[PDB]
DNA sequence: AAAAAGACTTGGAAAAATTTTT
DNA sequence: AAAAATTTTTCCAAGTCTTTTT
């Protein structure tokens, strides 16, 4: 082990003094079909050269997937298989509705099936080989320390797939070559060989950046990096800070609320547009709003980039007064819906920037992200719109608790509410078939076992009953052994009951990892000698190994 | 100050592992 | 074992924010 969080923090400017590793694990070699795989075109059979045959299989293994029906993936796969076709094959396919991929599919399908049920010897196999592989590349050296490389293995080609209605779905994913990649490392530590007879793009030492490798996607021209893992003195580090700056946060919080409060009648046009949407921002966690290269990435949004067509307003709605009507396409094009009641100051404001504009209008315009953070990092330091939802967020958590959170009780009474308290903070964040209703032939089933020890611990009497020895008054002690045992194994299923029920739609995958303070709940563990172990899983708690090792139940965030 | 590039963190989906039911 | 129900792991797109550049 290697407790860094005990160690003396870096000048602000270097991320790291010295960096050693054996540079990324490309993509293996195309395997190409065997003789008696055939595609075809036209009802003709035709074998096609490696690169297009090698495109041609990513569709294959696709085939069975509704995205290779839609028209963007169709038109964009084609135009880039296409791209990869042989001068003489070009003059041949001119459609792909005519290609005839059944064969190729039926052939992976198959390959799956022999790899989802093979010789126990070659699991084992190839466990030791991952394994293997994990061994020489899996981890990298920063600064007197080994520690682990989060992804060595670069991106295979294949076809992309973006999220929602995505334009550029379909296009390919080119494959990587040593000459793309560009290696990190410092001055002195042992540049890695690439590939026999091969050249990296560039060796460049920075010790301002914290990635191993990079380089560019040909799909977004955007970049792709390869950094350490969790619990890297390096990623760590930054997620307690992460947590510490919305500490900060906790004191000024009223400060800044009071105060753009008293921003939202400010006769300049700007300011009043930014309190807003800093307001939301703050009611319903929403997300900054960086504006988008139009065309690159899906049509979706964020508070700064909110048009007039993405929410209504009512004077008067459904009871309530003055209501904000959200409904736009969030990130990953998790759709955002939701009726809000504001502020009468705050709709009369809303109102305003809703005048001389198309529904394709800005409802911010003169308002962004810039403008934003730039403020609320004068407000405070580091503030930015995002430290808000880890804020609010991880305050509820140490809140939930003590409101639900008996002095005294049995553990799953504990994690009962624990992980079901912090369940309406994980919603309201808006996280997003027959599995529920197979809970009867089983919580039915062992709640029967309820009636078991039920009945029978009635033995307990008419056993020890007349009876007056201490032989057969060992068979009642037992008798309760058989009820907190199972007791249990009835309230040990009580919560997935509350769970499921409201948190369905809403996951919340994000709760147990990003925005909450790991200390909020490593203390409260301790607390009540609850163990760790029970509520983060082996990897959660490699993570938070800093959020572990200090903090005591003495912590509050 | 404005846009573009570069750098990280967020977060859901799919594949893989482990457990539980048939 | 075989199958289905879960949980943990891998994977990488999509965002936020920061720096660079003009």
Known sequence: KWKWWEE?????????????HKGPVFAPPYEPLPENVKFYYDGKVMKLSPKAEEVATFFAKMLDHEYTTKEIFRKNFFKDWRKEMTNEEKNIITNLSKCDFTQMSQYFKAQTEARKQMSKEEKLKIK?????????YGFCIMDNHKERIANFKIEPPGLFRGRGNHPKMGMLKRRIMPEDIIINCSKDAKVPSPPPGHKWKEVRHDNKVTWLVSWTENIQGSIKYIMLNPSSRIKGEKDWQKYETARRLKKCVDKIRNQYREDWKSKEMKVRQRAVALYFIDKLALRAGNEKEEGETADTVGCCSLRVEHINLHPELDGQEYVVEFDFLGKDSIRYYNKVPVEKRVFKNLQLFMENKQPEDDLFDRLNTGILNKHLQDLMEGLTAKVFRTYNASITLQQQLKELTAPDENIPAKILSYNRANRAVAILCNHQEKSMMNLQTKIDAKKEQLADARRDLKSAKADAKVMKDAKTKKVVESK??????????????????????????????TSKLNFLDPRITVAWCKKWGVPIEKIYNKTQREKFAWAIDMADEDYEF
């Open 8 to 20: 003396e923090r870096y000048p602000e400017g270097i991320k790291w003094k010295f960096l050693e």
């Open 480 to 509: 309760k052994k058989a009820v907190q045992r199972l007791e249990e194994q009835l309230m040990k299923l009580e919560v997935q009951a509350t769970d499921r029920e409201e948190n369905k739609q809403i996951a919340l995958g």
């Open 128 to 136: 030791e080989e991952n394994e293997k592989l994990l061994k020489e």
